[PDB]
Amino acid sequence: DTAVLVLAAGPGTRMRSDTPKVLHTLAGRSMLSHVLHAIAKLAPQRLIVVLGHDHQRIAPLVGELADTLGRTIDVALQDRPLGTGHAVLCGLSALPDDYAGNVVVTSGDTPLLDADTLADLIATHRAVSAAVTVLTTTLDDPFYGRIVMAIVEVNAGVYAFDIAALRSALSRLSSNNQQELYLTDVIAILRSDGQTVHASHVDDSALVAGVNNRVQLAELASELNRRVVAAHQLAGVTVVDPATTWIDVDVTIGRDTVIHPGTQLLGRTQIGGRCVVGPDTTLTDVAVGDGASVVRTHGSSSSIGDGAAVGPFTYLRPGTALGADGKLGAFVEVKNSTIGTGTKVPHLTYVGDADIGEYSNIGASSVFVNKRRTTVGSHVRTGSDTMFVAPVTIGDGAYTGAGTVVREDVPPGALAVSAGPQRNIENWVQRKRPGSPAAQAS
């Protein structure tokens, strides 16, 4: 039996933020969520999180996280900002007084720490019957106090403890130094009691790296990102420039797709196999089938079918569904609309809140204007500069003239027109502009 305490109670001062440090995000999850996902993979019997400013936070634990993870996470509060030693004391109150098992202590600002690293700590600790084991790592420039004697190779800030050793070393602890009670002092107290102080060493330094400021945040965002890219590359995805390709965790991509530079794939986006994600593409929660091209596109909450072509310069808003072999071309925007198999919207148009059938063609520079919705049939051909004033129904195989405004329904196989006929005014430019265009004409 192991109880895990996450200390998330500090102020996060040097973030210079009105957003609590621990709720700051990277690769798709907040630091706290990254911390709790790794620990939940470990599955200890008791998992407890300790808080300071607690109203914003407590809501997202358990509420959202204990559910998403399908387990209980207890929360303990820390009324006075006493320090990490006291925080640990606050977390222990949530255990039955007669609690038997080990206690592992961690923070909420190490977003890379993983279940294996935690498991190895617990394993070394039971192996040597320890009392206390402390995780460490070795660096180039130590700042990160420093490391078994004691603590001022640095200290990771992650500990396994014997509950009886811990409760006792804590009962006898002071303050004078910042003016708080550190947990590091538990190591020196148990050394006085002639206790065994063990230390599990982590070769991979970035797994236990913490975030105190926005410079360090960007660093770990960067390292985590390299590791998600390299995992996709090794499964069969070409990433031309891993330095300018941000891929969130969860995002899935398949065999032989090519990802070109300047691309972010975010949230729960999925890419099928054999795709081309061109350059400068940003997709959050977008699903793409196999053999599709998505180039210079900014899109979210949408789906793009197999062998379809989107880009360059296309904007997809929430609720867009484009069928297989479909096309959205340059300078098009689509919001909350369904577009069938094989249909093409190639240029300078906006399609909002409509449904379009299959193998239809929408002419350049058109607009769907506004609970009824416009509906357009299959094999329909609309001419350039058509405005579709909602709601309106266009039947299968219908056509529209260039420069038409559609305000009424159009039957299957009718041509809808409105533009007046062309008149030429001979020698106008000679008379109304004498100079320039006038000459030529001459």
Add this chain to the structure above:
Amino acid sequence: DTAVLVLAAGPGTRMRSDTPKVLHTLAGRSMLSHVLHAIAKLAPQRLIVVLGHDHQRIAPLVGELADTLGRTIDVALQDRPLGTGHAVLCGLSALPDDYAGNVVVTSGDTPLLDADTLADLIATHRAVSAAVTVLTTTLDDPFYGRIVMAIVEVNAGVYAFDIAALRSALSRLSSNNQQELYLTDVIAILRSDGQTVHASHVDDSALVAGVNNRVQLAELASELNRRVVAAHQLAGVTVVDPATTWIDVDVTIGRDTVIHPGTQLLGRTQIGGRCVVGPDTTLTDVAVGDGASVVRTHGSSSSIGDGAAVGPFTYLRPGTALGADGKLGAFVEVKNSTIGTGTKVPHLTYVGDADIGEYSNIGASSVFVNKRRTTVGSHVRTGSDTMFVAPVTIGDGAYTGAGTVVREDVPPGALAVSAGPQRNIENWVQRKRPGSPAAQAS
């Protein structure tokens, strides 16, 4: 009393440029301007710049720089390309023959050298009563002759001197070697005269790094850029990808704003707090209020109010002012135009040389065509595909139909229309296209 000489007289051959080496830019200023800004912070009593090809240059010193800095910068010319030793001799002529104080010598191609580094040099030099002190630094791969004995840990190329020692060591100097007179030889001459040769060492190597070619230029542009980003991050700005975020010096940004990858912020741009600068945004001299979003936008000389939304795919030309809570959407361009509080230009339009009031809506795919100017009132709603042929006045709460061309004024609360009415040609496609669209209709 200290006189500072900047040697800016060499040809800059391996830049392979028709632009004088010293006028090549990074982070917003030319190398020379970066050099003179640091020295002007030092505030010596005499500041003198020595030139070779001098017509392009002399204009920007003092002219532009001595003003901007509000002090005098004397200029000395160097008629024959004799070398750095002679250049220094040329610079000394601009001093009263009976000049008392120290002489500090620097180049115009170290754009990172700062006032502190200069101050420490002067301080060490007076501390030991020196005659000559020379700045040095230590590197991985020395190229950068090499360092107290003499000079072939490398030599920075920055010196403090006693004026009497300097004038004397210079009077006795030769040429044979390139075939010029080096200043490095002053160190070996004063060593013969048994003089004290001191040396101030700089740990931060990049402060004294110089630029001889375009590979080194990009390097220092890169290093300076990391340091401007990290300063913003530590003040409370999230930069998701510091490697692809170019921020010029002077640019100011505020608390809790988020800057997404592929963004350049240039010239005297200002970002308020709580903003989102999405990805792929380039802004030169643009001012943005608090809580505004600016995503995939290319803009200059413009202002965007509080809580406004611009992007993705928007182009702002000089003289654009957008009020608070305003909106410019995808595929819009705006030049020299004022747009009031709460007004929205959401799609595929161009607005040139107009003024628009508050809480108005401009319909998709419209154009403001051309000393009079078009003026549009508040709470106005224009329909899609409207062309506003300047000059024209649209009164408050007026409307426009889809596909209207406005050539005349529209009173408060009138609807302006021009499009003809819709006609349907039944069974047209059967007759004019037998095959395809024809079937369906069937």
Add this chain to the structure above:
Amino acid sequence: DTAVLVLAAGPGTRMRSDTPKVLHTLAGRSMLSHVLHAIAKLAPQRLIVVLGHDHQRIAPLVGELADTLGRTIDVALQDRPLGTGHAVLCGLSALPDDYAGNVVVTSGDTPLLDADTLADLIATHRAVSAAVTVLTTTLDDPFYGRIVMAIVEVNAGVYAFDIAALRSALSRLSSNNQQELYLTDVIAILRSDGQTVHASHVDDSALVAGVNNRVQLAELASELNRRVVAAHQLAGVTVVDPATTWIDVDVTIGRDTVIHPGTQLLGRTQIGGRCVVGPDTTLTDVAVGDGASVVRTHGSSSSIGDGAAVGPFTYLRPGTALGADGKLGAFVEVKNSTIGTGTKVPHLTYVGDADIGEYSNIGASSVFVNKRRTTVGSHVRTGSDTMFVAPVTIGDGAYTGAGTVVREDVPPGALAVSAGPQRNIENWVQRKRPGSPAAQAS
């Protein structure tokens, strides 16, 4: 006389690809093409490539490569997947039994190896009368068996041999270990025969780096890219951000042009001198004259004349020719069209399959709709929202009204119109919308 064998017969398993490893590309050429281009520069008397899955491959050697290189490349097949030792045996069959000269052996997955490195190997080998020489290099983390005794400073995998020594050491070779015949074992066999084993060492490690997976592919793509950028920078091209500028081999760029971040220049693209390639530009096979600006543009198979301006947000499709001093502005797309000296297409238009003369102006938000082609004369001014329904001829100095649909020819100096006249409906908004826009009007 030297015969060069390229071993391109392995499966490439950890690429996780349906595209043969050796046909995977970087900087414009496949790895195999990069390998054969370097060797063809060497010009040995016999060049032979050995294959496994061979149908896709054999076609591109010689077919395409032996031609492009203007020499013969023989191909040898390897029926059973026996290993590199056997592959070499298969390659030797393509030599006359009585072959006299040296044999150099290389792979098809080292895309950086160059002719000098090959020449130095051959030179060291003849210098010491060797039998076998093996190329080596020294690394930070060896994985890359390891190096004269034998092979488990690592082994490059490139060898020079005496033909008689090689044929003999090969005749006596086994299998048990993977379960194949390695060529590394030839080194240990000739050591038994007391033969001289020489070893040419390569300081530049990246020249002999190989690609087994997509992580290593991106690495070498990155290194090759740094070296092409630095060569352009040293010839007089400013690259603001070499990390986000992909330039393919062959691409040429000239003096004093500036390349801004996020730019790929691909295929056989050429940039003249004094240009500005803004940020976020992607050009494949595009030719640009001197003094032109190309900003936020995605283009291919096209040409842009001297002092012309394209961008931001412009899309060029194959067959676009734009003359000198021409302009394509924001949100324009052009396919297979010719546009003369001095003509401007500034906003929100599409131009497909047309020819346009000189000093013409095309008004915002227009479309060229479809063997005849539309033709537009010089000094022509078309108004906004004009649809040109192909085919149609517009004569020199002709004009068009705003919101015109052109279906018929327009003579030199005529004005073409079609839009109806403007009508205002007074007090419409009071009656049809009581609330909001209604008030004002009040």
